[PDB]
Amino acid sequence: VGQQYSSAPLRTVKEVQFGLFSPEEVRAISVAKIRFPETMDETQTRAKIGGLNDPRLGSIDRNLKCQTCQEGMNECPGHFGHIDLAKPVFHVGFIAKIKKVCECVCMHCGKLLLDEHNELMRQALAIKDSKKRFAAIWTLCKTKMVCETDVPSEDDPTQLVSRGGCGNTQPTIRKDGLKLVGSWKDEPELRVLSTEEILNIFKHISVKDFTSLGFNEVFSRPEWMILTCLPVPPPPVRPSISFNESQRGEDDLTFKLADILKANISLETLEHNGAPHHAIEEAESLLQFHVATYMDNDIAGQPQALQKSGRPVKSIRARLKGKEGRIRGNLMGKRVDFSARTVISGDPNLELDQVGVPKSIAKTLTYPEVVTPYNIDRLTQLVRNGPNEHPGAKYVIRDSGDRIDLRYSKRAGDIQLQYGWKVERHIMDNDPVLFNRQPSLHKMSMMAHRVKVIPYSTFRLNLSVTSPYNADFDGDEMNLHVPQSEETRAELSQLCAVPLQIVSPQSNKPCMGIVQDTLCGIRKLTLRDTFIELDQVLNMLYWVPDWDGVI
Amino acid sequence: IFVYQNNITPSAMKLVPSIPPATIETFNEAALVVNITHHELVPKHIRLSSDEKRELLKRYRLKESQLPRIQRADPVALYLGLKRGEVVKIIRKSETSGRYASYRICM
Amino acid sequence: STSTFQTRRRRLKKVEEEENAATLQLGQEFQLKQINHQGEEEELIALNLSEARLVIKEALVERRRAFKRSQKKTREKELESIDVLLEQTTGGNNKDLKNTMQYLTNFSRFRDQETVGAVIQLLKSTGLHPFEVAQLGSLACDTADEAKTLIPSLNNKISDDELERILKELSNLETLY
Amino acid sequence: MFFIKDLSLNITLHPSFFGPRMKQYLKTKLLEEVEGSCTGKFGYILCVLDYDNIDIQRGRILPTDGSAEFNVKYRAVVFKPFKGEVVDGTVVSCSQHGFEVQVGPMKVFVTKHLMPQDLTFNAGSNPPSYQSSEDVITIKSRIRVKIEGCISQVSSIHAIGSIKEDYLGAI
Amino acid sequence: LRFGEMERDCMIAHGAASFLKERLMEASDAFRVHICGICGLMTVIAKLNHNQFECKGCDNKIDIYQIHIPYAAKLLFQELMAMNITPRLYTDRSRDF
Amino acid sequence: AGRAALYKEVYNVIASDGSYVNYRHMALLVDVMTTQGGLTSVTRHGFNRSNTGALMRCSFEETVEILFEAGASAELDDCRGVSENVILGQMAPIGTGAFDVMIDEESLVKYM
Amino acid sequence: RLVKALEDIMVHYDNTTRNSLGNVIQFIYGEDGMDAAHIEKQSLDTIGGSDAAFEKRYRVDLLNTDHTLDPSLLESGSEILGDLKLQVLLDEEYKQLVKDRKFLREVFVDGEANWPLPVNIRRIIQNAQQTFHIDHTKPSDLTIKDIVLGVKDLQENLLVLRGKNEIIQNAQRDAVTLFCCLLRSRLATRRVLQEYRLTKQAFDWVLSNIEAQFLRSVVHPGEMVGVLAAQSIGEPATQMTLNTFHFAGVASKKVTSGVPRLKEILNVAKNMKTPSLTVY
Amino acid sequence: KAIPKDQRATTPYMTKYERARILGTRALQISMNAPVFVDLEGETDPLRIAMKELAEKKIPLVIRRYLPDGSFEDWSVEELIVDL
DNA sequence: GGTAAGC
RNA sequence: CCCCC
DNA sequence: GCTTACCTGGTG
Ligand SMILES: [Mg+2]
Numbered sequence A: 001v002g003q004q005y006s007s008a009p010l011r012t013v014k015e016v017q018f019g020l021f022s023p024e025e026v027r028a029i030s031v032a033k034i035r036f037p038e039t040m041d042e043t044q045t046r047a048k049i050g051g052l053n054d055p056r057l058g059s060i061d062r063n064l065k066c067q068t069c070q071e072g073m074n075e076c077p078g079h080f081g082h083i084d085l086a087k088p089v090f091h092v093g094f095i096a097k098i099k100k101v102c103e104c105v106c107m108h109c110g111k112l113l114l115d116e117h118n119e120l121m122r123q124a125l126a127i128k129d130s131k132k133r134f135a136a137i138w139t140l141c142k143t144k145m146v147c148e149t150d151v152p153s154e155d156d157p158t159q160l161v162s163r164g165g166c167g168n169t170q171p172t173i174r175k176d177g178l179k180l181v182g183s184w185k186d187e188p189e190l191r192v193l194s195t196e197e198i199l200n201i202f203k204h205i206s207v208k209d210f211t212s213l214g215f216n217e218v219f220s221r222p223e224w225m226i227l228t229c230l231p232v233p234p235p236p237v238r239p240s241i242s243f244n245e246s247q248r249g250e251d252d253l254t255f256k257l258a259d260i261l262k263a264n265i266s267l268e269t270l271e272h273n274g275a276p277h278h279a280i281e282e283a284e285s286l287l288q289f290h291v292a293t294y295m296d297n298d299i300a301g302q303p304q305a306l307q308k309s310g311r312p313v314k315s316i317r318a319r320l321k322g323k324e325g326r327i328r329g330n331l332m333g334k335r336v337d338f339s340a341r342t343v344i345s346g347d348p349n350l351e352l353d354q355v356g357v358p359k360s361i362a363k364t365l366t367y368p369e370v371v372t373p374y375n376i377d378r379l380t381q382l383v384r385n386g387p388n389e390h391p392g393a394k395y396v397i398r399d400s401g402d403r404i405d406l407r408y409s410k411r412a413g414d415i416q417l418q419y420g421w422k423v424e425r426h427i428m429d430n431d432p433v434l435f436n437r438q439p440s441l442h443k444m445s446m447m448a449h450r451v452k453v454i455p456y457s458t459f460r461l462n463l464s465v466t467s468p469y470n471a472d473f474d475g476d477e478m479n480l481h482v483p484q485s486e487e488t489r490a491e492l493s494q495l496c497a498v499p500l501q502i503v504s505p506q507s508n509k510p511c512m513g514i515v516q517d518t519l520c521g522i523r524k525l526t527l528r529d530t531f532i533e534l535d536q537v538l539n540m541l542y543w544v545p546d547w548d549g550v551i
Numbered sequence B: 001i002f003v004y005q006n007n008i009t010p011s012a013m014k015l016v017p018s019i020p021p022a023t024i025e026t027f028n029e030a031a032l033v034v035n036i037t038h039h040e041l042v043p044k045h046i047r048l049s050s051d052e053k054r055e056l057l058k059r060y061r062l063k064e065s066q067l068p069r070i071q072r073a074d075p076v077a078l079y080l081g082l083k084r085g086e087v088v089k090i091i092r093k094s095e096t097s098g099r100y101a102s103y104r105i106c107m
Numbered sequence C: 001s002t003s004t005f006q007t008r009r010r011r012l013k014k015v016e017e018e019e020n021a022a023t024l025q026l027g028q029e030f031q032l033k034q035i036n037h038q039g040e041e042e043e044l045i046a047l048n049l050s051e052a053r054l055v056i057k058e059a060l061v062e063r064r065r066a067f068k069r070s071q072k073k074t075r076e077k078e079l080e081s082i083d084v085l086l087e088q089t090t091g092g093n094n095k096d097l098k099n100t101m102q103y104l105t106n107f108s109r110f111r112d113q114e115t116v117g118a119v120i121q122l123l124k125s126t127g128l129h130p131f132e133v134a135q136l137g138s139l140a141c142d143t144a145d146e147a148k149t150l151i152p153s154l155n156n157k158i159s160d161d162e163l164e165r166i167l168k169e170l171s172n173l174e175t176l177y
Numbered sequence D: 001m002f003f004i005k006d007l008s009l010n011i012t013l014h015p016s017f018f019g020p021r022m023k024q025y026l027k028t029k030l031l032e033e034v035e036g037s038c039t040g041k042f043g044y045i046l047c048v049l050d051y052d053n054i055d056i057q058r059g060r061i062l063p064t065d066g067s068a069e070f071n072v073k074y075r076a077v078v079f080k081p082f083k084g085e086v087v088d089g090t091v092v093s094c095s096q097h098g099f100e101v102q103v104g105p106m107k108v109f110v111t112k113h114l115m116p117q118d119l120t121f122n123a124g125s126n127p128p129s130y131q132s133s134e135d136v137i138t139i140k141s142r143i144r145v146k147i148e149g150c151i152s153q154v155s156s157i158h159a160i161g162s163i164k165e166d167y168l169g170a171i
Numbered sequence E: 001l002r003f004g005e006m007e008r009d010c011m012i013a014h015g016a017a018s019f020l021k022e023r024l025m026e027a028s029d030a031f032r033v034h035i036c037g038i039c040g041l042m043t044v045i046a047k048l049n050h051n052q053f054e055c056k057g058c059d060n061k062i063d064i065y066q067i068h069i070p071y072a073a074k075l076l077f078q079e080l081m082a083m084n085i086t087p088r089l090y091t092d093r094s095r096d097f
Numbered sequence F: 001a002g003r004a005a006l007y008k009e010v011y012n013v014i015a016s017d018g019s020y021v022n023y024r025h026m027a028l029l030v031d032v033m034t035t036q037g038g039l040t041s042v043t044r045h046g047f048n049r050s051n052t053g054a055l056m057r058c059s060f061e062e063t064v065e066i067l068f069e070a071g072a073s074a075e076l077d078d079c080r081g082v083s084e085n086v087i088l089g090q091m092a093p094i095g096t097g098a099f100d101v102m103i104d105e106e107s108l109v110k111y112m
Numbered sequence G: 001r002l003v004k005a006l007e008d009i010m011v012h013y014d015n016t017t018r019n020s021l022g023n024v025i026q027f028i029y030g031e032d033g034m035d036a037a038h039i040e041k042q043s044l045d046t047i048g049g050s051d052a053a054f055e056k057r058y059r060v061d062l063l064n065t066d067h068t069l070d071p072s073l074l075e076s077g078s079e080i081l082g083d084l085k086l087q088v089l090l091d092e093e094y095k096q097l098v099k100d101r102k103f104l105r106e107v108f109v110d111g112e113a114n115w116p117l118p119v120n121i122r123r124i125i126q127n128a129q130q131t132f133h134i135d136h137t138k139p140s141d142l143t144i145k146d147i148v149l150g151v152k153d154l155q156e157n158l159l160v161l162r163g164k165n166e167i168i169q170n171a172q173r174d175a176v177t178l179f180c181c182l183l184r185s186r187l188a189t190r191r192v193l194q195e196y197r198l199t200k201q202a203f204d205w206v207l208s209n210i211e212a213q214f215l216r217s218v219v220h221p222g223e224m225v226g227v228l229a230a231q232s233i234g235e236p237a238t239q240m241t242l243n244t245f246h247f248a249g250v251a252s253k254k255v256t257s258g259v260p261r262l263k264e265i266l267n268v269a270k271n272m273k274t275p276s277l278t279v280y
Numbered sequence H: 001k002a003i004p005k006d007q008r009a010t011t012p013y014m015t016k017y018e019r020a021r022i023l024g025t026r027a028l029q030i031s032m033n034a035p036v037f038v039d040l041e042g043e044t045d046p047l048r049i050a051m052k053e054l055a056e057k058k059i060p061l062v063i064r065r066y067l068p069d070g071s072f073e074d075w076s077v078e079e080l081i082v083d084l
Numbered sequence I: 001g002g003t004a005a006g007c
Numbered sequence J: 001c002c003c004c005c
Numbered sequence K: 001g002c003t004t005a006c007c008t009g010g011t012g
């Protein structure tokens, strides 16, 4: 299920280990170096370049060409490349954490501002939950504004023991946009702390110290919150919408990456050349801007990295942010195949658990049946019927993977079925199907029904089942979902079947009764005054399917 | 148990944990005026022995983590003088079953 | 592919892969302290070709017994004899086993299980590594110098004299082919 | 060397085989998959022992597919070569670059330069040989080699060998 | 049609586990990835026809797995990776709890 | 007593409206809001800030922020929650997923 | 928010209610271990009325001519008068029924008798009478032992929890406390004979059915109880109003109510609109 | 860690979910041409066949009930009581 | 444009 | 947008 | 005790 046999063992995910990329790992997992803002045109020749939007990272042209892997569009996950940053830059997502870590460590020697020699600190270091522990250590260390050489000994308060020298005064760090500014102590020494400066002291934090802060020696060292080697995501993440040959619109990410690239080439040029040093600070802060603005383009610090159109550039963070987001809109909820929707109509002649399905829908929706000696003859007949007669079939899936399209196949008239083949046949009477009415507020908003293929364009349902759905026939639309396994259809029939939902466990009472015409007519039928003579009594008895035949 | 009128000076409050294994508990006179355990909404909380606790965890196949928790500062935890780790059995009346017992681990 | 009994430990930690030698640095998979199916710690099983030849022979014989039970509802000579058993139990396609049996039958020093048992007894008193014990049963040495050169691991472990007593005994047990 | 190892293979069996002679087919698929195989990790998985007692265990039926996956716990004879292992073998091929030696299931190749200077290749001889002041090495001759190193090659391990050092060579 | 969040909630309430997976996988975007056994990443350079596996910079080739995940999650993970986050997917439990 | 009062309060809002919910539902909500020792709001600050797995918590409200913190603190999601199995397209340990199904070769033989 | 907060709550194979971390939320689902679809409002008789009427309805005194069981009610009636050995049994029966009434009056302080419980006992007896064609003008073949000990044994098989230890066995005793109160109150010797007029065959069928029905009623390990609760509180919330103004036109009488009060609650809002003490 | 037979404490009755999964699993297998342990007296639907195999208690499957700690109780579909 | 938990 | 309980 | 940073029903 992602096409074509893989010899690799298939397993399920049991654990997800979150972490941060070391720059060394980004280089290790890279396929292409990435160095030109240019995406394509080999000078002018329409084909992708050795710089951006890959050699290598994946493909376009629905032409296999995916670097040696050579697997082609559906099969190929893209491959990451990298871009080496001319100067280190903070990751937006970690700007605050960086501030807090600087606020916990001596900005000179990299030691923790407090230790075991402080009673309040000991209480915090004891904290089991890393998140709560870092919050405590910070609340303590933030105020500590000197890297004490010696502190009073555990026994004698008059005497002191050397902890870990340095003795340097710490700044009072304030965030100025994407910059971190310090104020040491006449009037205070005000200076902006460089990324390199921070990175360096983060690199100098003891494992014991960064493990005391929320960090991980293996998976997430604090120094990794500072970016140095940027992973370039492959084309599948940033697809180039091709408007048919020599006309292709690249993704916003592709454009942003080109800006990161251009800003970087710029900085690397001045750094190498006659660096005017007050020009260097500009190209540096610009690189910082693009790298920030690529991941998050909704920062408090107003300038909203715009597209030349006046549009604001879709940050990666923006793609994930809920309802329409990646998580909420694509993972928690999906748009799905084997589905149908029409206007619902009511039917007194359908059993409580049946659903009237328009032929057109029945001929579209298709359950895939495995050729077995029990169905071999039946399925053979549906294949013969083709995709246009009601009891029919659309495709025949062979042992040999590929599916036969009965509407086009030259062999569609022939086809001698074999055990194990799947016949994708039309939805038929008594197939269990999931019927739904949005908003789905209850378990009873979705119930399994037995198909009843019928004429006309409406899903027809039994009047009694109207109430659980909270549906009426003033043009309400309802949804149908077709189960595809002999296993999922058993879930529907054995768990979600309409008759199984009769008593609701919300209110602890039944959730379906007799309604409207029948409720009105039942009172009328059952008064003393109401008598029936033979002629009708017989038609009335004949109407009860289960009648014993006894007058 | 120290029953003070208004307040215990911070200077004196420092001496409190200074004598282990003995534990000092400070209660304000005003707090003790009414016995909160007597309230309509307050059920019977019972202090479990180290062995009774061992069994509870065994029988439900639990990590201490997975037990419902009671704060150390909890009016009832303070009343029983519950230490951290101590489990309390809670017998409440149920409108569903007649009686229902919960457990809370003092953290 | 096939897995083992040695439980996976290092998280990411890349791959700090170490070399394998005769400083008895056989893999992680070939450590002295092994863990058997039953869960217990077992010592490494290393076989001398002879020990090895008989293990495979016996294993294949019991397989034909099981295969015939379920079907209801002298070196030159021993060489053809084996090719019959293999053509009966083995998948045919297993050339690796056929090449092995020809090798093992042509290079075993000890024919019978009594002689193999005697070797195995003698060399077990030594308290040497299962690798050195298997090499002392597979390579025929005359002097402790031969043994100690060919099996470098042995070096300070056994006395030159004690080793020489052992090689005299192994030479006496050597089958007259 | 030539070890015995406790191992376990995961086999996924299709519903068609969920009949009485099921274990019979699992033990079969185990011998196909595993026996005659070679890994850098374990070496050559030469022969599965105790056929009468191979452990099937229970098999989990897999969610959307009907198949059942068993971890077949077993015990086999393996051959894993090592650097510094002294092996006895027979000469198979022979050239101006050296000679290859059959050692059990694998080949150890000896370079002209990883053999004593007096051993000189003779193109002439039938079959081609390596001769010295008192020795002749050709196809079929027995040699004691010291493995210099190994290479894991998909379904085989090969090695470079020496007969330069003392007590190695013809036998 | 959208089988949304609320719809997912009724399948949960129903206890229709297998129906739910089918609706999100087979009925929508099931995809197959090759995961390295060392870093839990989608690094594996799997050449299927040649049976070549490889995760360079793990120097794998051997410890590799096939996983079935919704393409949108393959996307989510590559997006998180693009933001220096490593969502390492493992096929065994290290915690054992 | 806090839980007892909270139930009384939750009940009284639903019931004043005329509406009826079986006890066990409100009981459960009130219990969830309470097992942590104090009052845990059904908000992004409340329940969503608990020790539950990253991916599950990111599915409600603080999506990206949750995932960054997950990365920096090297969080381990055991995929025990529904949301995690939904994101991974795996059968959740829910209802028909709350147990395993095995073939018994012993009985498989006995049935022949 | 309700759904997202309760998502992961499910009933485990140990009848415990747990979340994704495996933390216990409820030790037994909804305190009783019963599935809400098998719960029906039933009347706990014993709780109300005068002590006199209770005594009339339940007390059987074989040692007293006026308060014995009438020989018309059971065949045993004539020889049961003065039986000290059986009176010790009826003395237990009455003592427990009193103990029950005392306890019910502790649980439900207002005296409210109607509570949703599993197994509609009214119907079982009703059906037993229509099945065996109960003759309310013929003496019963039941014994006092048949009744007294019969009910006692049934209580032993009303299983919610299983475990061969005191924790589980006590937890089991507890879960069944309120049901057994109803059971004992409905199958008292005086009630069974003088009201229901059951036969041994009929009474047996009743005990049998109560057992079966009770078992059918317990929650199923795997129930996604969390979402269920979230949706059960969610759907009525959907129908509440923002405004209401039922106390408008009278200030100095203000209440928060409806949606706003539901938010104040779920948000554990610190600055609530209508704070109020009710001092007794 | 597997709770031994004599020490099993879970319900003797098959859960509504266990049943649906068995019938589903067995129908699936039957539909994939798996061997049938019942005499199909003219039956054809893999679910209707599975139901027969269930009713005749000739389903060779076992449920592995997992407790929240990881330990488990294996239960045969033979010994499990199908009421419902 | 409403609430709270940051500084 | 323009439609919904 | 003020400013920030999160959120705001369902389909089509
Ligand atoms: Mg309408």
Ligand SMILES: [Zn+2]
Binding pocket: A057, A058, A066, A069, A070, A071, A072, A076, A077, A078, A079
């Ligand atoms: Zn590729």
Ligand SMILES: [Zn+2]
Binding pocket: A106, A107, A108, A109, A110, A111, A147, A165, A166, A167, A168
């Ligand atoms: Zn310092």
Ligand SMILES: [Zn+2]
Binding pocket: E036, E037, E038, E039, E040, E041, E043, E055, E057, E058, E060
């Ligand atoms: Zn890797």
